[PDB]
């Protein structure tokens with residue numbers, strides 16, 4: 397009547413055998429989980445990575461959150477220790493409900509969350525130790541360093557240790573040399589009751605995986621990848637200010653929005669309470685949001701499998717159409733892998749090869765098109781050496797790598813080959829095609845991949 401909880405997302409309890417390789421398991425559940433956007437994974441009962449930290453030596457400054465449905469917030473936006481945050485968090489929840497914190501039913505905190513965010517008269521604010529970069533404060537998982545206990549050593553090399561998962565073989569973001577520290581390094585989240593994360597999808601439509609180390613549950617809502625644009629259409633009509641164009645990736649606009657609103661518009665939505673020791677996995681382009689039930693501690697990281705590669709290319713195209721900034725060049729990543737074809741996993745090699753083929757056929761067509769526009773002069777250019785802000789298309793902000801157009805008239809400016817007419821007002825013959833590779837360089841790179849794929 398007031399809040400109708402979405403149906404539960406899938407929950408998986410893998411045997412030790414299935415659990416042994418996370419990527420195999422994720423590929424296995426994919427047909428199910430991608431229909432719901434998020435899923436929950438319970439590790440085998442004895443898989444218990446030790447969390448050990450001094451609650452007095454980790455400091456952080458949390459984000460302040462107003463709890464206001466449809467109100468805009470920035471995706472990335474007073475000082476606490478873990479102990480002092482915990483004391484604040486427990487007292488807040490305790491005083492809010494006038495009860496002990498583990499007597500407050502999760503269904504009631506959920507009902508109450510959606511009540512207070514929709515009520516203008518309430519101005520509840522909370523704090524969230526969010527997007528704490530694990531570089532400074534350190535992972536909740538064991539990492540190599542002082543001296544580690546034998547049980548910690550058991551978990552050092554686990555695939556499910558979220559420090560490992562980025563840099564494993566079945567992962568694609570591994571051999572990226574470019575700076576993508578926002579997508580390779582785990583983030584830490586210190587939650588309190590009602591602290592929340594707005595509806596979003598991951599950069600470049602990657603997967604994500606979120607582990608709750610300890611504390612009270614984290615409540616999730618998720619939408620499957622296929623419904624991403626449905627969700628966005630619903631959201632555009634109700635909160636169009638979220639969809640205005642805007643510079644940098646440091647300001648993307650996001651919001652809290654009731655799942656029942658989406659369900660009313662026939663957008664499929666699923667839910668779960670993630671408890672301590674459980675993983676949530678989000679699939680490519682799966683919108684998700686949620687809130688914490690109480691004091692807790694989670695750790696999350698992005699990753700990319702071979703399944704994702706074509707979506708990665710589609711995302712960058714979609715970014716271009718939106719005039720949105722890229723975190724990295726997808727083509728640059730593909731070529732880097734091609735250049736390391738001999739040491740690639742063979743299934744990876746085979747999949748990169750397929751994407752590269754499309755890349756090369758698209759590049760060929762784009763180059764013919766700009767030649768017919770009267771761009772004649774050309775010069776090779778090592779795009780990967782340019783800082784990103786020095787190789788974005790003036791028009792669509794895409795990060796150039798395969799090629800770009802420059803002009804003597806507007807020195808330093810580039811456009812991608814889609815936006816040749818947007819570079820300057822000089823005639824075409826004054827333009828130059830800057831290219832990383834000739835077509836003849838490219839076919840051997842692809843063929844290296846083919847030999848490796850056998």
Ligand SMILES: O=C(O)/C=C/C(=O)O
Pocket residue numbers: 526585592593604605606614694696
């Ligand atoms: O725990 C968080 O706030 C992060 C949610 C996510 O993985 O997007």
Ligand SMILES: [Mn+2]
Pocket residue numbers: 497498
């Ligand atoms: Mn307690």
Ligand SMILES: [Mn+2]
Pocket residue numbers: 463464465512513514515516517518519520
């Ligand atoms: Mn409110």
Ligand SMILES: [Mn+2]
Pocket residue numbers: 596597598604678684
């Ligand atoms: Mn996320």
Ligand SMILES: [Mn+2]
Pocket residue numbers: 714
């Ligand atoms: Mn997008």
Ligand SMILES: [Mn+2]
Pocket residue numbers: none
């Ligand atoms: Mn355009």
Ligand SMILES: [Zn+2]
Pocket residue numbers: 789790791792793794811812813814815
């Ligand atoms: Zn462009």
